Amino acid sequence: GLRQPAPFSDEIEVDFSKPYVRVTMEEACRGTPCERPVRVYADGIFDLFHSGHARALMQAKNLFPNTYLIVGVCSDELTHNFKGFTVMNENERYDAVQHCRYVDEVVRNAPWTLTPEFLAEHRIDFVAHDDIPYSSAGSDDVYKHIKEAGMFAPTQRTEGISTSDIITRIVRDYDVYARRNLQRIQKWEEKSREFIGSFLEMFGP
Amino acid sequence: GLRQPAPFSDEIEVDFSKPYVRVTMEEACRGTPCERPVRVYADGIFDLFHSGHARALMQAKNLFPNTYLIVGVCSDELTHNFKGFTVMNENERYDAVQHCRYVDEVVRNAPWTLTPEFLAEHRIDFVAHDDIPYSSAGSDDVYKHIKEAGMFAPTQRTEGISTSDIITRIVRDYDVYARRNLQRQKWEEKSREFIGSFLEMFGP
Numbered sequence: 001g002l003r004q005p006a007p008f009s010d011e012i013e014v015d016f017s018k019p020y021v022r023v024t025m026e027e028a029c030r031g032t033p034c035e036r037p038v039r040v041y042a043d044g045i046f047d048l049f050h051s052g053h054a055r056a057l058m059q060a061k062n063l064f065p066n067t068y069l070i071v072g073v074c075s076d077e078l079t080h081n082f083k084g085f086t087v088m089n090e091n092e093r094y095d096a097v098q099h100c101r102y103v104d105e106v107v108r109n110a111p112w113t114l115t116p117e118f119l120a121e122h123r124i125d126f127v128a129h130d131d132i133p134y135s136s137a138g139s140d141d142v143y144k145h146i147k148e149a150g151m152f153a154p155t156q157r158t159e160g161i162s163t164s165d166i167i168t169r170i171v172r173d174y175d176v177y178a179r180r181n182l183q184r185i186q187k188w189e190e191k192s193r194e195f196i197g198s199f200l201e202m203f204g205p
Numbered sequence: 206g207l208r209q210p211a212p213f214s215d216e217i218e219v220d221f222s223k224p225y226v227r228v229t230m231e232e233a234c235r236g237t238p239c240e241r242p243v244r245v246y247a248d249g250i251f252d253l254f255h256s257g258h259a260r261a262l263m264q265a266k267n268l269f270p271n272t273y274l275i276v277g278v279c280s281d282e283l284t285h286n287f288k289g290f291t292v293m294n295e296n297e298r299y300d301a302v303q304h305c306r307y308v309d310e311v312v313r314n315a316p317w318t319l320t321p322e323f324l325a326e327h328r329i330d331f332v333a334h335d336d337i338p339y340s341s342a343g344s345d346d347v348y349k350h351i352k353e354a355g356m357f358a359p360t361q362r363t364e365g366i367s368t369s370d371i372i373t374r375i376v377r378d379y380d381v382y383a384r385r386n387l388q389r390q391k392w393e394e395k396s397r398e399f400i401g402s403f404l405e406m407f408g409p
C-alpha cells in the first residue's frame with residue numbers, strides 16, 4: 001500500500017549526467033530495469049476528478065511492465081482560454097491527482113501543446129491519452145506530432161462518466177427544483193432544455 | 206508503484222482458522238510484524254469523491270507504521286434514507302474509492318452503524334473518522350460505542366472542500382445564468398433561500 005501522496009515535478013532530484021534517451025515499444029514492453037523504468041506522460045484538466053480519469057491513468061500506468069507515471073495538469077489560466085471553465089481551480093485539481101493510485105509524479109501548470117524541451121526536460125518516453133484528435137485552437141489535433149513520433153500511447157475512455165455528466169446531473173435537478181418554488185414559467189419549461197445545454201457549453205466542446 | 210485497483214471485501218479470501226483478536230494502540234504503534242498489519246475501518250458516502258475524503262483516508266493509512274486500510278462505502282438506499290441524496294451513484298462511489306492511493310481494500314454496501322460481528326468478519330482493529338459526533342437515525346452519535354471501546358481513531362477534515370461545496374459552485378452560477386437568460390423578478394431575494402434548501406436535500 002501507499003502511505004504518502006505523489007511527488008510534484010519540483011520535489012524530485014534529477015540528473016543531467018543522464019542524457020536524454022527514450023526507449024522503444026519493444027524495449028519498453030520487454031520491460032525495463034528497476035533503476036530505469038519507462039516514463040509516461042498523461043495530461044488534462046482533471047476537473048471533478050473521477051473514475052474515467054483514474055482508469056485512463058491506470059491504463060497509462062499499466063502500458064509497460066516497469067513504468068513511471070507522470071501526469072501533467074493544466075492551469076486554470078490556460079484552460080479557461082482554450083477550453084472553458086473549471087468548477088475546481090488548479091490547486092484542488094493538483095491535490096486531487098496526487099491522491100490517485102497509479103500516479104507516480106504530478107506536473108503542475110502543464111502546457112497545452114507539448115514541446116521537444118518539455119519532453120526532454122521531463123525525460124518522457126511515451127504519451128498517454130484517448131485516440132480522438134484534440135482540437136484546441138489553431139490545431140485540428142494537438143497530439144498529431146506526438147502520434148507521428150511514435151511516442152503516442154492511446155487509452156480508452158470510461159463510459160457514463162465525464163465532468164459534463166456530473167455537472168448536468170446536478171444542474172438538471174436544480175433547474176426543475178428552483179422553478180417549482182417560484183410557482184409556490186411555461187417558457188422556462190420550453191427553454192429549460194435550451195438553457196442547460198448552453199450552460200455546459202461554457203465548460204467546453 | 207501501484208498498477209492495479211483495490212480489492213473489494215468479497216473478492217478476497219479470508220481464513221477463519223484465525224480467531225478474532227484485536228490489538229492495542231501500544232503494540233500497534235510499536236509497529237506490527239509484516240503478516241499481521243493493523244486493520245483500520247473508515248466509512249462514508251464519498252459522494253463526489255474529493256481531496257477532503259482522500260486525505261482523510263491518508264491519515265487513516267498512516268495511523269500506524271504497518272496498517273491495512275479497509276474502507277466501507279454506504280449504499281444509495283441507506284444514504285437516501287438516513288442522510289440525503291447523492292449525485293454519485295453507489296456503484297460509481299464504489300469505483301472512486303478503488304482508485305484512492307491509501308486504500309488496500311474496499312467494502313461495498315456498508316452499515317450506517319457498526320456492529321460487533323461486522324468488526325468480527327472484517328477483523329477490524331480500529332476505526333478512522335472525524336471526531337465530530339455523527340447524528341443520524343436516533344443516535345446523537347453513532348461512533349460513541351466505538352469510541353467507548355477505545356477502538357476509535359479520529360481524523361481531521363480538510364477545509365475549503367466538501368461534497369456540498371462542489372454543488373454550490375455549480376448550482377450558484379446556474380441560478381444566475383438561467384435567470385439572466387430568462388429575461389431574454391424578486392427571484393434575487395429568494396435566490397439564497399432556494400440554493401440553501403437545495404443543498405439541504407444532500408445533507409446538513
Ligand SMILES: C[N+](C)(C)CCOP(=O)([O-])OP(=O)(O)OC[C@H]1O[C@@H](n2ccc(N)nc2=O)[C@H](O)[C@@H]1O
Nearest residue numbers: 043044045046052053056112129130156157158161
Ligand atoms: C489539454 N491537453 C490536450 C494537453 C490535455 C488533454 O486535455 P483533456 O481536456 O483531454 O483533459 P481531461 O481532464 O478532459 O481528460 C483527461 C484524460 O482522462 C480521460 N477520460 C476522461 C473522461 C472519461 N470519462 N474517460 C476518460 O478516459 C481522457 O481520455 C483524457 O485522456
Ligand SMILES: C[N+](C)(C)CCOP(=O)([O-])OP(=O)(O)OC[C@H]1O[C@@H](n2ccc(N)nc2=O)[C@H](O)[C@@H]1O
Nearest residue numbers: 248249250251257258261317334335361362363366
Ligand atoms: C454514515 N457513516 C457514519 C456510517 C459513515 C460516515 O458517513 P459520512 O457522512 O461521514 O461520509 P462522508 O462522505 O460525508 O465523509 C467521508 C470521510 O471523509 C472525511 N472528510 C470529508 C470531507 C472533508 N472536508 N474532510 C474530511 O476529513 C470525513 O471525516 C469522513 O471520514
